[PDB]
């Protein structure tokens, strides 16, 4: 396999934290240290910034995430707020602001349905919000299960399940009981020896990647009751198990991982400035899967690679950002 660099973008001033593809795949957004969000549209063969969003946050914007509808965008920043931007007038303005977190907000995520919004912060908490309209936002649950800084929140692709990665080396699943009408923690995943930075589900949603500060990525499989293997859940809820651990592939902490829903490829953003692509082996067993590194670009950036995101529309197109102040769009060929 080969990883090919297509474009390099330097819109922001300073380090760039997050990038995310629009569900149409022709537009992406980026946030960074400059406290500004840049919307990038593709005209011809060149990518360019069409709009610049400023003054929405007083502090650094860590992550931005598109709605499943793709109309409006939400940003988690260090000013303990999560801003909501909307293009109702043909131009993007900040209509609503979500406050409540005690410290810096680290992550946002949208559910598959699009009516649920989840945030996590350095206050060891994971919040879930309800969206009844653009003029209305209602807090659904405030959860404090994590003992340390919560790094990321990611929703399940097919179902309304929430996953959270934390500085406490653990991952936590969250599901709501129908009879109870309240959110609760489903299971706790404990195999990493250091901070869990990133998480991403596979296409169907029965598996999960996680990258951590321990320079390893792990594959988690969801086991429901009555599994053939023989794994039993003392509670009614499902349990996840570490069925694969890739080690020695990364020199430093892995800050982000993305699992493509079109190809099944896995990309990692490491602190050694390197992007690595992993693909599941052809004969890999469903209880002990084997993943092999097909291609990598050790000099993908001049500094730490902060985020990697596959394109939902264009198969094999990857985007990444780094502390060197660059956004790079890649094309992988198996």
């Amino acid at each position: 396999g080969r990883l090919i660099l297509e474009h390099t973008l330097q819109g922001h001033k300073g380090r760039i934290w997050g990038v995310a593809w629009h569900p149409k795949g022709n537009v992406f957004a980026s946030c960074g240290e400059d406290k500004a969000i840049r919307i990038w549209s593709l005209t011809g063969n060149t990518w360019s910034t069409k709009t610049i969003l400023s003054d929405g946050h007083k502090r650094t914007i860590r992550e931005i995430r598109w709605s499943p509808c793709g109309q409006y965008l939400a940003s988690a920043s260090f000013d303990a707020t999560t801003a909501i931007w909307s293009k109702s007038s043909g131009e993007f303005e900040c209509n609503a602001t979500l406050e409540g977190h005690e410290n810096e907000v680290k992550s946002v995520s949208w559910s598959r349905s699009g009516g649920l919004l989840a945030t996590c912060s350095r206050d060891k908490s994971v919040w879930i919000w309800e969206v009844a309209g653009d003029d209305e936002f209602e807090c659904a649950a405030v959860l404090n299960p994590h003992t340390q800084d919560v790094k990321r929140v990611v929703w399940h692709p097919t179902k309304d399940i929430l996953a959270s990665a934390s500085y406490d080396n653990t991952i936590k699943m969250f599901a709501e009981e129908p009879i109870d009408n309240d959110w609760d923690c489903t299971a706790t995943l404990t195999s990493h020896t250091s901070t869990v930075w990133g998480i991403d589900f596979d296409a169907d949603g029965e598996r999960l990647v996680s990258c951590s500060d321990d320079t390893t990525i792990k594959i988690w499989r969801a086991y429901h009751p009555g599994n053939t293997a023989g794994v039993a859940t003392p509670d009614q809820q499902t349990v996840w198990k570490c069925v694969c651990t890739v080690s020695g592939q990364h020199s430093r902490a892995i800050y982000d991982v993305s699992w493509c829903k079109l190809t099944g490829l896995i990309a990692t953003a490491c602190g050694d400035d390197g992007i690595r692509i992993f693909k599941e082996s052809s004969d890999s067993k469903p209880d002990e899967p084997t993943f092999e590194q097909i291609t990598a670009e050790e000099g993908a950036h001049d500094q730490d690679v902060n985020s990697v995101q596959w394109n939902p529309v264009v198969a094999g197109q990857l985007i990444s950002c780094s502390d060197d102040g660059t956004i790079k769009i890649w094309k992988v060929t198996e």
């Binding site: 380090r15 650094t60 260090f78 810096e104 680290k106 350095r122 800084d149 250091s194 602190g271 001049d302």
Partner: protein, 150 residues
Amino acid sequence: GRPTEIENINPNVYDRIKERVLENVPDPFDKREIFDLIRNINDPEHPLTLEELHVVQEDLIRINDSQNSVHISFTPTIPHCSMATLIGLSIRVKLLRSLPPRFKVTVEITPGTHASELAVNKQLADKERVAAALENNHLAEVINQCIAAK
């Protein structure tokens, strides 16, 4: 991760050594230069430098210019120093500003010299928490007092 097999030698390394085979002479980064960057950092609470309190020492610094790696080991004044993270943070900020970005800096407590060394090392190694800490105006001001040269 795993060490390179003894039978193999990396082509980029071999060529790069042959490139070096070919005033204008370059000066490599060494322990002394890094030590000169952190020796005069002031203690947050006392009118002494980290060198005078033996918090930083030249032989507690490891660096490889070619491999783009710097390791700093600092010894807190007391085994339960409540300023260990602040002191280690001042070292990072000075090195973050003074070193080329190609250098990956690791700042850890000298082993066995502090009760919470694992927890402190983990904070200083988290670039996100370090970045968020610098956006605290009171915290960045105290750091600048320690980093100031006079």
